[PDB]
């Protein structure tokens, strides 16, 4: 009759709201306002890399804090060493629209995908020295927006058809499929222990997922529009989200509520990428105002500003040993800050 | 509607803690590794590859 | 420019009339002061914008910055000249400065001319043949800028190797470039000045005029799309204006220069000096008119300038 | 000095390859094709012929065109339309003999005209299926007044250029349909991009020439803007 089910859903939502309002005993701006302010943080460019003909859409750091991968709408993958600005590899693509990259934790493989509705998996260590495509995964019905590795045998993938999936490399078949979103899935992140992951999908909503089960653990709401970036806190019990309403927010996983909201009255632009630092104090963000901001996590104030790009900042990343920060924007240049 | 009801039912029964506990844990982790971050505490120029 | 006979020198009656009159003690300093006050900040601001806030080096900026610098260096030592003219045609400031003033004036004028010509040719090359490459243009622009400057610093040497100040006791005056000996006007200087007047004005004039006329005739052809008229028509207007500020402000000076030296080396008299002073007054106004025609009639440049201040 | 000898070899080889690729790339033009389901964009594509997104290439007077058709996607497109900010022309193909889904066509045109990431791109407008329009108007069983009553106040402009043999009624209909789009085009008054209308049918072979002429004009306007001449 469609009436009883909606009534039960409303009752359950009311119960959840009461449970969440019961645990909201204080605001964290009250028990974090007597700490030593970080100060003034300023950074300068140490190097600049050239060679792309068009916009840079994504990038990723390796596990040695030395080698990196980047890719553009030219149809080009480039593998750099950042110690000496010299190139090591260049790979051409079979399609000209690609929107995500990755880097295997062992240094042997790379992965890519785009509007062609297919994932491409490339091998780097061959006896002939020539990089040739190894695997190719198809089965989605929409543009592919992110892809990461767990080991050399499994790849987790997110697409624009409101679904996510886990793939087994050898057989070429999906092992499990995650459904439950209602709109375009854009941002994905893996837990540091490689046990869970988190996703956000253009409905002003975010969700947590277990890998081996295949069902939602918990769902968070609170934004006003699409969600574009997502990342884990280093310790494994928090994540910070960026949206198109000019706001960053922080959530934990045990209280199911907002903790800090970072925003400003003079900002009416979007967020394109977000990342964290090793200790957990510095939060970096890239905006459409042609610049980037650096914030502190426990204070809800500003610390500094990075400038130097002539277009939108599209990709950002911070290394595994904490030594440098890399950025790439629509002007076809990558920059490194320390 | 049935799927939404099932989702809300499974989400309802979750153990929850107080916010100040999570705040304490986060500030504790921030303090414990404060000295090892090469951006809050800048590295001496000698050992910096950059 | 005026002939002094024969060290004590002497001059004739018309020269005496002009050197102590009101044309060269009242009129000229007004023009120079107005030019100075109007033109110094304009090129200063243009050069600031072209040097600091530019993000990418397009060829047009490469040529325009050089033109602006040429005008700026042309307009520096004017106060010395106003002080000269107001004191009654008498120079009391030494010897090096006379050479500096003459050389910088003439060299910077002709550098301005050559850069105008280069802009014209590149505009033709782009519009009447749409295909091109930006980086090769940047390389060629830098090369040609260096060539032009080095050529200029090689035809202002003969003005540093001739004594320019001459003493006249009959009036108690000392003169910087207005009086010169007869045994030099009929000789070396005749050759040098006709060489400059026919070498670095006429040929660039033909090049520039031909390029702009062909561009207009192609932009009004009956083989172009009719959904663009309101833009193309505007373009025509600007082109005409530029030609107008080129031929009017430069042809009279060179013509009267040639005529003056022809009268001196042909017959032996001189009664055309006042017209040359006035035509040169007209020529020196382009240090103030150029930034309003090549720089400010656009869209983005005005916004950048407003953001600068 | 060191033992690192690939540190020059690999860099030099890769630089050579990228230079060759740059010279190949910068001489091509790229176009995006949009339309509805009942539009005849597929027939046009097949005529100048000689999953994700479909792709075609053609060559006119030694210039290479590369055209992109959006394929098996979902209905909502507000997120991947931002990947087309560096193309020269949007080719918009709209039906002309339906009278029902025409308003949705105008509204979509308005939406793609005022988007923020596409305020420096021009539109070439193709109105397809003309002979059907002629036959349908001559049949006279359906009146345009039931959907655009303002047609009752429209008269042919004095500068009309009809091909001989056509009744003035069909000419009036054609010009009214064109006028709606042109007015919505000029409504902004932005003065940074232009709309180029044409009429076309199911069997015609001069579409490549039209695209070439329009692209040539677009490049010329860009160059005039760039050199402080306009």
Author numbering:
A (entry chain B): 3 to 340
B (entry chain G): 12 to 61
C (entry chain R): 37 to 42, 57 to 359
D (entry chain A): 13 to 62, 205 to 253, 264 to 394
Question: What did the article's authors report about this structure?
Answer:
For the PAR2/Gq complex, a miniGαs/q19 construct, which contains the crucial Gq sequence for receptor engagement, was utilized, whereas for the PAR2/G13 complex, a miniGαi/1320 construct containing the N-terminal region of Gαi2 (residues 1–15) was employed. The structures of the PAR2/Gq and PAR2/G13 complexes were elucidated through single-particle analysis by cryo-EM, and resolutions of 3.25 Å and 3.2 Å, respectively, were achieved by the gold-standard criterion of Fourier shell correlation (FSC) = 0.143. Notably, the intracellular loop 2 (ICL2, 182–185) of PAR2 in the Gq complex is intact, whereas it is missing in the G13 complex because of its flexibility. In the PAR2/Gq complex, the density of the Nb35 region is notably lower than that in other parts of the complex. Consequently, we opted not to include Nb35 in the complex model. Our previous studies on receptors capable of coupling to multiple G proteins suggest that polar interactions play a crucial role in Gq and Gs engagement, whereas hydrophobic interactions are the main driving force for Gi and G13 engagement because of the distribution of hydrophobic and hydrophilic residues at the far end of αH538,39. Consistent with this notion, we observed that polar interactions play crucial roles in the PAR2/Gq interaction; specifically, the backbone carbonyl group of V394G.H5.26 forms a hydrogen bond with R2846.32, and N392G.H5.24, E390G.H5.22 and Q385G.H5.17 form hydrogen-bonding interactions with S3488.47, H1082.37 and S2786.26, respectively. We also observed hydrophobic interactions between αH5 (L393G.H5.25) and the TM3-TM5-TM6 region (M2655.61 and L2886.36). The binding poses of TL in the Gq and G13 complexes are very similar, with minor differences noted: (1) the carboxyl group of D62N-term faces TL in the G13 complex but turns away in the Gq complex; and (2) the side chain of I39TL3 faces D62N-term in the G13 complex but turns away in the Gq complex. With respect to D62N-term, in the PAR2/Gq complex, the carboxyl group forms a hydrogen bond with the backbone amide group of E63N-term, whereas in the PAR2/G13 complex, it forms a hydrogen bond with S65N-term.
Protease-activated receptor 2 (PAR2) is a transmembrane receptor that is irreversibly activated by proteolytic cleavage of its N-terminus via extracellular proteases, resulting in the release of the tethered ligand (TL), which binds to and activates the receptor. PAR2 plays a pivotal role in the inflammatory response and pain sensation and is a promising drug target for treating arthritis, asthma, and neuronal pain. Combining functional assays with structural analysis, our study revealed that TL forms a parallel β-sheet with the extracellular loop 2 of PAR2 to engage the receptor. The binding of TL triggers a conformational rearrangement in the transmembrane core, releasing the inhibitory ion lock and allowing receptor activation.
